[PDB]
Amino acid sequence: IQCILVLDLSIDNAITACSVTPHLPRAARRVELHLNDFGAERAPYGGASDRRTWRCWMQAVDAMLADARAQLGAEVEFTHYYLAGRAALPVFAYLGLRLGKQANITTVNRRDDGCWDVVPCQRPRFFDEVRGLDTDERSSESGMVAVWVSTQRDVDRGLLRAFARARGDRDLAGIVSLRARPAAGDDTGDMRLLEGADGPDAARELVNCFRSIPNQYPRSSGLMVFVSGPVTLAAMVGRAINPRIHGPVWWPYFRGGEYEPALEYPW
Amino acid sequence: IQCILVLDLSIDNAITACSVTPHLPRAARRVELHLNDFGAERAPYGGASDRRTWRCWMQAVDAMLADARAQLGAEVEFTHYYLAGRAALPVFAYLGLRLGKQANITTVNRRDDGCWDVVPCQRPAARFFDEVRGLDTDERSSESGMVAVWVSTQRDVDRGLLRAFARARGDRDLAGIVSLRARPAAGDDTGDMRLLEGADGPDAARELVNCFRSIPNQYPRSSGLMVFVSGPVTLAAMVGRAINPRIHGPVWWPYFRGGEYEPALEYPWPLISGPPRILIATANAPEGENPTLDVEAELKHLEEALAEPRKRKLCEVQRCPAATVSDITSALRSFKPHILHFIGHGTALGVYLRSAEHDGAQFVRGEDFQQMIATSLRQKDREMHLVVLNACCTHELAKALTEQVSCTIGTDIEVYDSASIHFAARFYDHLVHGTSVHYAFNAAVDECRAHSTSGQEVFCLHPAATPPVRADELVFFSP
Fold first, then answer.
1. Counting one residue from A and one from B, how many pairs have CB atoms under 8 Å apart?
2. Which chain B residues are within 8 Å of A153, Cβ to Cβ?
3. Residue B160 forms contact with A (CB below 8 Å)
4. Quick one: which of A239, A16, A267 has its CA closest to A149?
5. What is the signed CA dihedral for B280, B286, B291, B292, rounded to 10 degrees?
6. Given CB atoms, is B139 within the 8 Å cutoff of chain A?
7. Any CB–CB contact under 8 A between B247 and chain A?
8. First CA to last CA distance, chain B
9. Cα separation of B302 and B429, whole Å?
10. Residue B433, CB half-sphere, CA atoms under 13 Å: how many?
11. CA distance B174 to chain A (A)
12. Contact with chain A for residue B29, Cβ under 8 A
């Protein structure tokens, strides 16, 4: 029982569910949905240019999810979800938060070399650097937490300082960075590959990090999440966040070497 | 030729030079110097509480070294240094850093059982730190920031405490962790500690020097050091010897108290921690004023020279518009400012604050204002560096505030003929451009004299064993 959500918003290289199906297992029931069927108009390279378009995409994702659960009916606790499409990382992160951690989430993305990576977020050390939380004390500074999750780029904290300055929140509560170094002997440079074997383990590590965050920073009042890498990571990080504990949550967009604000739940 | 530098810094059972003397070899000339009579207040168990006491101890050590050099003269070539006393470990580490690797030093210290260890750090004419971690690895990180170093003979390295202290200080960065715990030999009665005797003194000193010289190759793009000495004072002196401040830079020696570390001694002494805090206190109309003191224009000048988004990021300017006695006491007891800039009138006995519910002047005398400042300077970690009394005839109060506040700027009689507005606008502009207080004050008063009809010297700077910080090195904003 599968319900594919194809997040097609790129004008350049769009994919339809027809590219998703040959890598999916056998389906007793299959549901097709695209985001373009719900009023979210397309944008270049999967990223919007205005706050209005980001809000339209947010409400369109909400409408997609409402239609998906209404069409699936009562077996929505039996549906193994699948994620694909080519849009920005904040959109995948927002959908991953909206589904929550209980649902079965699998993400299909296409690599740089034609291999199609299918990766589950649950079962049927990846993050070598875990810093900002591996101390023992409890911070007393109010503000908002900036979380850097990436697989290709080490943390440049000055960008986080400048982005926090840009949005009026003059004080960040703390910086947490989770990054995977590539294994020795791998020829991928600074990038750590994300196969299907190492998916649920990294999902579990992200889960263990994200509700241990208020243990380390109980004084804080929100989360900024900065994501660099594949969209599987974006949906993975979205699945990790619990909005009732951590809210509000921000996902900014990286354009032109600078960070621009993209999605804020609630709006 | 010997120079006993005894560090008597403990209110309880202490050590004088007469106690040290029988354990050291005979010599022709002996210079005995105590840290106590160089302006150092003693503390419980040799561990200072307030940050001002640590700074006073630093300056006392520097003055004691200077006087030792002055007493020895040209005989500083053939001088053997002997260190003793009952002080905290960071003080010994700082003395060892100021003496450097090119000085014949030797620590003497009484054990638990009354045996007097004599530990020379140099060879006269196996691995002590057998467990070394962070260097033998090929973990040559290029990450920026500080480097934590754990040197101990008793307690094994705890990464949580080091990162806890570093995040508490706010420096959100460690390039790595280095530990040099010295495991005891097999079957010795000491248990979990290793005895540091004069037999394995120089070998331990050499191992420490090799470690601290191989740090910058391992962590190339690092910034400073964070040294956590845990053992006898001889080890602290050796560790201080091994560090070269020119290679590394900012070196910190946290103090252990109550199961955690506290900021105790840093060599390039950051006399303001974090952003400086400036308090503006306004008052006018003392019922007989020269017609109107435009406090609004003065605040326009101070805010146009004291507001850009980046230097409002670099400093907090809290004002107290039309303040009272209670308002200023609350501001001094909550904001904890470093710069007090009062704007208002005043007589020979000074400040006329805006009064209570009767809107007017509550004439507050100079001794009451000085007592207010002194009372606000009783909380922990509190030093006010600059009090600017932009008022009338406030020369004696600015003279008498020098023993509470390091540098003060007062006025003679210019009762606002618009020949003093040039001062406040350019003075703070010179501060926020990275200049010292002395140069800024001189430049501003030269601008005020040129705008005058005569030699108007309308403002006067009143500066002040362990002397306070002088106006020539008092700088607030980093360039």
1. 22
2. none
3. yes
4. A239
5. 20
6. no
7. no
8. 46
9. 9
10. 10
11. 10
12. no
Note whether A137 contacts B167, CB cutoff 8 Å: yes
Locus of tokens 């045996």: B115
Residue B11 contacts A, CB cutoff 8 Å:
no
Asked whether the beta carbons of residue B163 and residue A132 sit closer than 8 angstroms, the reply is: no
Task: Report the gap between the CA of A71 and the closest CA in chain B (Å).
Answer: 49
- Of 1.20.1440.130, 3.30.2290.10, 3.40.50.1970, 3.40.50.1460, the CATH number of B277-462 is 3.40.50.1460
Tell me whether residues B167 and A134 touch, CB distance under 8 A. no
Torsion of CA A134, A138, A144, A146, to 10 degrees: -10
The residue to which tokens 């009952």 are assigned: B86
The domain segmentation of chain B, as residue ranges, is: 126-267, 277-462
Show which of residues 113-132 on chain A sit within 8 Å of chain B, judged by CB atoms. 132
Chain A residue numbers with beta carbons less than 8 Å from the beta carbon of B163 are 134-136
- B359/B357 Cα distance (integer angstroms): 6
Question: Do strands B352-354 and B361-363 pair parallel, antiparallel, or not at all (unpaired)?
Answer: antiparallel
Q: Report chain A's C-alpha Rg in angstroms.
A: 18
Give B443→chain A minimum CA distance, Å: 34
Instruction: Give the number of other CB atoms < 10 A from CB of residue B329.
Output: 14
Question: In Å, how far from its chain's centre is CA B213?
Answer: 26
Q: Both tokens of residue B247?
A: 């290679």
Task: Tell me, yes or no, if B161 comes closer than 8 A to chain A by beta carbon.
Answer: yes
Å resolution of this model?
Answer: 3.1
Q: Give residues with Cβ within 8 angstroms of B102, minimum separation 6.
A: none
Query: Exposed, middle or buried: residue A197 (CB in 10 Å: 0-12, 13-18, 19+)?
Result: exposed
Round the CA-based radius of gyration of chain B to a whole number and report it. 27
- Structural method: cryo-EM
CATH class in words for B126-267: alpha beta
- Interface residue A136 vs chain B (CB under 8 A): yes
**Residues B132, B135, B139, B142: is their CA dihedral positive or negative?**
positive
Chain B residue nearest residue A175, CA to CA: B172
Nearest CA distance, B84 vs chain A (angstrom): 36
Which residues, other chains included, contact B355 with Cβ-Cβ below 8 Å and sequence gap of 6+?
B324, B361, B362
CB within 8 Å: A134 and B313: no
What lies within 8 Å, CB to CB, of B50 at 6+ separation is B380, B381
Contact B227, B255 (CB under 8 A): no
Dihedral through CA A206, CA A211, CA A213, CA A214, nearest 10?
170
Phi, psi of A102 (to 5 degrees): -75, -30
In one letter, which amino acid is B156? D
For residue B160, give how far its alpha carbon lies from the nearest alpha carbon of chain A (Å): 5
In the structure encoding, which two tokens stand for residue B432, read together?
């926020």
| A212–chain B nearest CA distance, Å | 16
Domain covering A129-265 in this structure, CATH number: 3.40.50
DSSP-assigned states of every residue in B136-197: SS-------SEEEEEEESSSPP-HHHHHHHHHHHT---EEEEEEEE-PPPTT-TTTT-----
- Phi, psi for residue B98 in degrees, rounded to 5: -70, -25
Residue written as tokens 């470990």?
B89
Q: For residue A175, list chain B residues with Cβ-Cβ distance below 8 A.
A: 172
